[PDB]
Amino acid sequence: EFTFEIEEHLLTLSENEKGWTKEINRVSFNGAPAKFDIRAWSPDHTKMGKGITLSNEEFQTMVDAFKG
């Protein structure tokens, strides 16, 4: 299907007046395992924007640091 499916949405960091969003989601390319993704999303969610993907350790490393 060659597409990016938001498996799960976690958080919404911002939103511009045009209705795009900065989100943190678990996102799945082409049926591959869902990775952690912080990215700009269009209102309907069809078009996505720029942003990084994270492996588990990266995210986990990250959140543990925002924690102690």
> What is the binding site for ligand TMP (CB under 6 A)?
2, 29, 48-51, 53
Q: Which is nearer to ligand TMP, 12 or 55 (CB)?
A: 55
Query: What residues pair up with 6 in beta bridges, in sequence order?
Result: 27
CB–CB of 39/21 below 8 Å? no
CB–CB of 4/29 below 8 Å? yes
Q: Tell me the DSSP string of 39-51.
A: EEE-SSSSSB---
- Mark 33-52 with x for binding to its own copies (rule: CB under 8 A) and - for no binding: -----xxx--------xxxx
Applying CB under 8 A, the residues found at the interface with its own copies are: 11, 13-14, 22, 24, 38-40, 49-52, 54-55, 57-59, 61-63, 65-67
